[PDB]
Every structure is written in structure tokens, then in C-alpha cells.
From a paper:
De novo coiled coils (CCs) are particularly appealing modules for designing self-assembling systems as they are short, mutable, and sequence-to-structure relationships governing their folding and assembly are well established. For example, CC-Tri and CC-Tet exchanged with each other, as did the higher-order CCs, CC-Pent2, CC-Hex2, and CC-Hept. These two classes—i.e., CC-Tri plus CC-Tet, and CC-Pent2, CC-Hex2 plus CC-Hept—are structurally distinct: the trimer and tetramer have consolidated hydrophobic cores, whilst the others have central channels and are α-helical barrels. Similarly, peptides with Type II interfaces where the g, a, d, and e residues all engage in helix–helix interactions—namely the pentameric, hexameric, and heptameric α-helical barrels, CC-Pent2, CC-Hex2 and CC-Hept—also exchange with each other. To address this, using the insight from the data and analysis presented here, we have tested two different strategies for increasing specificity of coiled coils: (i) alternate placement of salt bridge-promoting residues, lysine and glutamate to discriminate the tetramer from the trimer; and (ii) incorporation of hendecad repeats to separate the α-helical barrels.
For the α-helical barrels, CC-Pent2, CC-Hex2, and CC-Hept, designing orthogonal variants was more challenging. Therefore, we took a different approach of incorporating non-heptad sequence repeats into these peptide sequences. Variations of this 3-4 spacing can lead to alternative CC sequences and structures. For instance, in 11-amino acid, hendecad repeats core-forming residues are spaced 3-4-4 apart at the a, d, and h sites of a → k repeats.16,63–67 Consequently, while heptad repeats drive association of left-handed CCs, hendecads lead to right-handed quaternary structures.16,63–67 We reasoned that replacing heptad with hendecad repeats at different locations in the pentamer, hexamer, and heptamer sequences should alter the hydrophobic seams and, in turn, might confer homo-specificity in the resulting sequences. Initially, we made several variants of CC-Pent2, CC-Hex2, and CC-Hept that extended the second heptads into hendecad repeats, with the new designs denoted by the suffix “-hen2”. In these, the original a-g sequences were maintained, and the new i-k sites were all made Ala. So, we tested Ala, Ile, and Leu in each of the three designs. Generally, for the CC-Pent2 and CC-Hept designs, these experiments revealed less exchange between the heptad and hendecad variants compared to the homotypic exchange of the parents, indicating that the strategy had increased orthogonality. To investigate this and test our hypothesis of altering the hydrophobic seams, we compared model and experimental structures of CC-Pent2-hen2, CC-Hex2-hen2, and CC-Hept-hen2 with Ala at the h position.
Residue numbers in the entry:
A (entry chain G), B (entry chain D), C (entry chain E), D (entry chain C), E (entry chain A), F (entry chain B), ...: 1 to 34
């Protein structure tokens, strides 16, 4: 159904963008170690 | 449908804004490297 | 519809506030670079 | 309707709390300036 | 209704946890001030 | 109902994980203190 | 049902990604501790 | 809410029209009873 | 909830009007019995 | 909203067609009266 | 869930009242014998 | 949306079938006149 | 899903009861024929 | 979606059953002519 599919698009989009934040934070950690 | 369309707008707008956060965090990492 | 309108309000409000977070993170990067 | 009103409450509660985060990040930037 | 009540629970739980993030960020600012 | 229960799961899961973020931020504050 | 399942997927995907953020912040704390 | 109000409109319109059918059938009974 | 209450109103209104139809048909049967 | 509007269309269409049934029953009563 | 239970009530109430119509029609059939 | 469309299908299918009942009732009235 | 299943129960229950009405009308026809 | 499919099932089942009622009524008309 179109509603369920849109809800899955939220899951996917939100998760992917949150993981980008996590990767940027690892970059902060590497900068601090360097 | 309109509910599905609005849900997709949440996915798009939240993802885009979270990616702006990720980018600002990379700016912080770059400042910490020097 | 009213449910679709309220979902759009979530999209707008969340995106705007997340962008304020990104802008604040940029302020942190500026402070580190000064 | 009650579902739309609860969604609006999500929009309001989330936005207010995310702006609290933005403000705390401004406090970090201010701490770094000082 | 139960859907509305569950949405209000999202609002309440998310806002409270986001405020805990804001507080922890204030603790970072305070550590930097010291 | 199953939709209400799934919303409650969003509330519980999101709140728990956001609290994990708050705790990790407090560890950052502690590291800055020491 | 499919809407309930999609909502559970939001819960799981968001909680997992938020946990990755928390871990990355622990990594920053470790970097700051030396 | 708008969905609830539309459902109430189904209840009202359907009941009123079904009552018209019952009245018409009473007219039939009256015609048979001469 | 308001949607469930409106659906219950459909059930109640439709059943009561359908029973008026059944009653009018009984009246026809009795007119035909003489 | 489109769901409310569709529900209103059910109310209108069903009511109108049930009234056509009631009218046809009145025609039976008329035929029985000569 | 309360919406599902209300829909089941429509099913039950409408079916019971329609069966009352069927019984009344059988009474007409018996009167015509007859 | 698909739910709205399926609701419009109920309105259409129900109204058409109910009109067939009304025509069949007119055929009874006609038979009674002869 | 439970809502979809409840809607299917409406379809089944109403169709079966309406077919009982059709059968009783066939019994009226037979009584007239005899 | 499953909800839209179940609504379509109501449309189909209800139409088919109502047509059976129309056909039985025409049998009554024919019995009356005979
Ligand atoms: N801000
Ligand atoms: N027949
Ligand atoms: Na849908
Ligand atoms: Na500042
Ligand atoms: Na569903
Ligand atoms: Na750590």
C-alpha cells in the first residue's frame, strides 16, 4: 500500500541520514586523535 | 494519496536537514585538524 | 485533508529545527577556527 | 480530529526540543569563544 | 482514540529524550568553561 | 490495536536510543573535565 | 498488517542509526581522554 | 475530525433512506388491506 | 476514538432502520394472511 | 480530505439509490390500489 | 484495535438485521401459500 | 489515493446494484397492473 | 492487518445475508407460481 | 494496499449479492405475470 511504502521511505531516508551523522562524528574522533 | 505524499515530504525534509547536520559536523572535524 | 496537513507540519517544523542545529554546529566550527 | 491534533503535538514537541538542542550547541560555541 | 494516544506518547517520549540530549550538551559547554 | 502498538514501539525505541546519545555526550563532558 | 509493519521498521531503523551516533560519540570521548 | 464526520453522514443518510423504504412497505401493507 | 465511535453509529443506525424494514414486511405478510 | 470526500460520496450515492427503491415500492402500492 | 472492533460490529449488526428481513420475506412466502 | 479510490468504487457499485433492485421493483408494479 | 480483516468480514457477512434475502424472494416467487 | 483491496472486496461482494436480489425480484414479477 502507498501509506506503508511512504512509511518505509521515512525509515530508509532517516536511517541513512542519521548514519551520515554517525560517520561525521567518527571524522571528529579521528581529527582529535590526529 | 495525500497522506502518502505528506509522509514522503517528512522523509525528504528530515533527510535533507539531517544531512546539513552531518556536513556541519565535518566542518567541525576540519577545524579540529587545524 | 487534516491528517495530511498535520504530517506536512511535522515535516516543516522538524526540518526547520534540525537546520537550526546545523547552523549552531557551524558556530562551533567557527569558534574552533578563532 | 484527534489524530491530526496528536500529529500537531508531535510537530510542536519535537521542534521545541530540537531548538533546545540548538541553543545548547550555541552555548558550546560561546564557551569555546570565551 | 488509541492511535491518537500512541502519537501523544511519541511526542512525550521523544521530547523528553531530546531534552536530555540538550542537558548533556550544556554539560559539555560547562566543562569547556572550566 | 496493531497500529497503536507499533507507534508505541517507535516511542520506546526512539526514546531509549536518544537517551544513549545523551549518555555518550555526558562521557564527552567528563573527558573534557578530566 | 503492512502499516504496522512499516511503523515497526521505522522504530528499528531509527533506533539502530541513533545507536551508531551514540557509539561515535563514545569514540570522541575516548579520543579526548587520550 | 473530517473522517468521523463523514462516517456519521453515512449513518444518517443511510438510516433515513432505509426508513423511507420501511414507510413505502407500510404503504404496500395498507394497499393490500384495502 | 472518534472514528470507532462513528463506525459504531453506522452499525446502530443501519441495524435499527433495517429492522424497521423487516417489521414492515411482517405487516405485509399479515395483510396477505388476511 | 480525499478519504472524507469519498465517504461522503458513499453516503450520497447510497441514500439516493435507496430512495429510488422506496419510490419503486410506492409504485407497487399504487399498482395495488389500481 | 478499536477501529477493527467497530467494523466487526457493523458486520454483526448489519448481518443480523438483514437476516430479520429474510425471515419476514419467508413469512410473506408462507402467507402466499395460504 | 488508493483508499479513496476503493471507497468511490463502493459508492459506484452499490448505487448501480441498488438501482437494479429499484428497476426490478418497477417490473413487479407493472406485473401487478396487468 | 486487523482493519483489512474486519473489512473482509463486512464483505462476507453482508454478502451472505443479502443472498439469504435473495433466496427468500425466490421462495415468494415459487409461492406465487404454485 | 490491503485496506484498499478489502474495500474493493466489499464493493464486489455487495454488488454481486444485490444483483442476486434484483434477479429474484424479477422472478417475482414473472410469477405475477403468469
Ligand atoms: N536557534
Ligand atoms: N420462480
Ligand atoms: Na494506502
Ligand atoms: Na553562540
Ligand atoms: Na495495513
Ligand atoms: Na568512551
Amino acid at each position: 500500500g502507498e501509506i506503508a511504502q511512504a512509511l518505509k521511505e521515512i525509515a530508509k531516508a532517516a536511517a541513512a541520514a542519521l548514519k551520515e551523522i554517525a560517520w561525521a562524528l567518527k571524522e571528529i574522533a579521528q581529527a582529535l586523535k590526529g
